[PDB]
Design a protein around this ligand. Structure first.
Ligand code: HEM
Ligand code: HEM
Lengths: 115, 119
């Protein structure tokens, strides 16, 4: 269809995760933001895409959002610091969305450069 | 068909509005997030031209913006992200944040504008 090509060729990065926080999607816009190729990210946990200073705390924020039930995600509204592979940091804007797909809970983070 | 997958429900249940148009400038997609931004139902937008979602003061210039990008090619390069004044159905105006993209599929050209509230 036109839905896979739309997110794949989106100017905004697109990081979909499944029920176990495993990255199932990582388009070329997200490859330039994070400095990771899609081969390095797919299958592994979300941990790598989270900054190292926020690594310990972030898994509890995802788990709490799943048990809540709420459709609309109110978190990650203002500018946040994305960390790349090489360690350098750029400012960004996340548009996080809960996605009821395949009888499970997902999360799509649409990211852009807000430098 | 597409609702059984993961990519349709990603854009359909996205917090950002999602307006897709095909090669003939006809809106083939209009999720519930875009229904609240524009004040239009999905039935009022699907099948109709793109100029209905453009503000009336920007209607003279917008058909020539789309036409130029189609003739350009440029080995494909999405476009841009900026803040644009959206005009609703009732006539009121809110400021937003578009994120226009260019998506080649089946040898045709489409455009997905991801919108959110910037007020
Ligand atoms: C640049 C990398 C990221 C950073 C720095 C980051 C940072 C944060 C922070 C600080 C919070 C807690 C604060 C708040 O409510 O805003 C949060 C919440 C959350 N994040 Fe992340 N995040 C990143 C990437 C992601 C990705 C890729 C996903 C999944 C696609 C994700 C999913 C979530 C979820 C589900 C919450 C819970 C929000 C809520 O309870 O409403 N994050 N993030
Ligand atoms: C709130 C309604 C909209 C407004 C006010 C608006 C405004 C504009 C403006 C001002 C430009 C010129 C580019 C610039 O000066 O930055 C433009 C270009 C363009 N617009 Fe719209 N737009 C709207 C909705 C849409 C939608 C929904 C689509 C299709 C999904 C679309 C497709 C395009 C395309 C393909 C271009 C050419 C980009 C370029 O090469 O400059 N517009 N629009």
């Amino acid at each position: 269809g036109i839905f896979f090509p739309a997110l794949e060729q989106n100017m905004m990065g697109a990081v979909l995760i499944n029920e176990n926080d495993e990255v199932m999607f990582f388009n070329p816009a997200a490859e330039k933001l994070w400095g990771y190729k899609r081969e390095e990210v797919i299958g592994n946990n979300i941990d790598m895409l989270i900054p190292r200073d926020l690594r310990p705390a972030h898994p509890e924020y995802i788990r709490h959002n799943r048990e809540g039930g709420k459709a609309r995600v109110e978190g990650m509204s203002r500018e946040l610091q994305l960390e790349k592979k090489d360690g350098s940091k750029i400012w960004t804007r996340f548009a996080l969305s809960k996605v009821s797909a395949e009888g499970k809970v997902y999360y799509l983070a649409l990211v852009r450069d807000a430098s």
